């Protein structure tokens, strides 16, 4: 809040595009541009290369994830369900 | 100030029409058409961003004129793969072969027990 009160990243859009639309965009704009922690090296190098594809600067590992987030809640849920079904089937 | 023109008929400034300034013994600045900057071969691993060392970065058709020693390095996978990934491949191959031998021994022991 040093410079802007409640816009931050969406301050580049200025007065345009509507306050509610900018507020809705802000979450995605922060999430896609935020660098995550790579769970291969432990470094904060996971950067969104393109839509749904993330790249590690150090590991050079490319992971197919969400469009704006590294891991989506739907992906986590489906992974857990698939693991549970695999364990149930194999016993 | 001496203003200079193109010495060819390609007036458009394109990739093939790049020039540089050069001073002649006649004491007049002229244009010399420079060749494109070649890049050294990249590692076949596909993981290391850096390019291979010990090899000249020149055009592929100039690689034909270049001698054999300039186009590679004296090593296994020399001039085609980086030393780091080469040694990683060596140790990975050794460890996988040892693990396969161990698995085969365990399977034989299980067959003998059964």
């Amino acid at each position: 809040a040093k410079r802007t009160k409640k816009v931050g990243i969406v301050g580049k859009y200025g007065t345009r595009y509507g306050a509610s639309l900018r507020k809705m965009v802000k979450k995605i704009e922060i999430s896609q541009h935020a660098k995550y922690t790579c769970s291969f090296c432990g470094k904060t190098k996971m950067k969104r290369r393109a839509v749904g594809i993330w790249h590690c600067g150090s590991c050079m590992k490319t992971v197919a994830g969400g469009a704006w987030t590294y891991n989506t809640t739907s992906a986590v849920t489906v992974k857990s369900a698939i693991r549970r079904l695999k364990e149930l089937k194999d016993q | 100030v001496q203003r200079l023109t193109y010495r060819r008929r390609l007036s458009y400034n394109t990739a093939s029409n790049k020039t540089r300034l050069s001073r002649t013994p006649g004491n007049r600045i002229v244009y010399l058409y420079t060749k494109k900057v070649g890049k050294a071969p990249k590692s076949a691993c596909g993981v290391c961003p850096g390019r291979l060392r010990g090899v000249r970065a020149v055009r592929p058709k100039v690689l034909m004129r270049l001698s054999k020693t300039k186009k590679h390095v004296s090593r296994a996978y020399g001039g085609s793969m980086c030393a780091k990934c080469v040694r990683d491949r060596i140790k990975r191959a050794f460890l996988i072969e040892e693990q396969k031998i161990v698995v085969k021994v365990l399977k034989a022991q299980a067959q003998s027990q059964k």
Binding site: - | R75, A83, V86, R87, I90, F94, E98
Partner: protein, 135 residues
């Protein structure tokens, strides 16, 4: 305990002989004031014998059963130890650290290592050491 012994076999991970199998003939692992890092003098094989397949004969079998050896000092970080060990004599009078200063002495060491490796390749002993690493 320590497992870098003059009977051990190592895989060279760097240099011109990358991927070659060698037998340690000397280990230092303390320093020399000229080679401070822990190291070991080894004798390896530059060229592995080719397959025979028994549909070969005599002269061609002899031609195939050829070994090109080398003698080299390597850092411990450039060697890959293994379970296997080769009980090759490799008389220390010829293979030493002084051969690396005189080309003739290194030539004699290479010749001696080649002779010993060729005479041990036959009889079907330590056949894993005489097979090139597929990587």
């Amino acid at each position: 305990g320590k497992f870098m012994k003059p009977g051990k076999v190592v895989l060279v991970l760097a240099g011109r002989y990358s991927g070659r199998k060698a037998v340690i003939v000397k280990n230092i692992d303390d320093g020399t004031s000229d080679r401070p890092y822990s190291h070991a003098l080894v004798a390896g094989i530059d060229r592995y014998p080719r397959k025979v397949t028994a549909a070969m004969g005599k002269k061609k079998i002899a031609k195939r059963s050829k070994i090109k050896s080398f003698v080299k000092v390597y850092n411990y970080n450039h060697l890959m130890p293994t379970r296997y060990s080769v009980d090759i004599p490799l008389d220390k009078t010829v293979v030493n650290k002084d051969v690396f200063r005189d080309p003739a002495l290194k030539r004699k060491a290479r010749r001696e290592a080649k002779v010993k490796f060729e005479e041990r390749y036959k009889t079907g002993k330590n056949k894993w050491f005489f097979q090139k690493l597929r990587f």
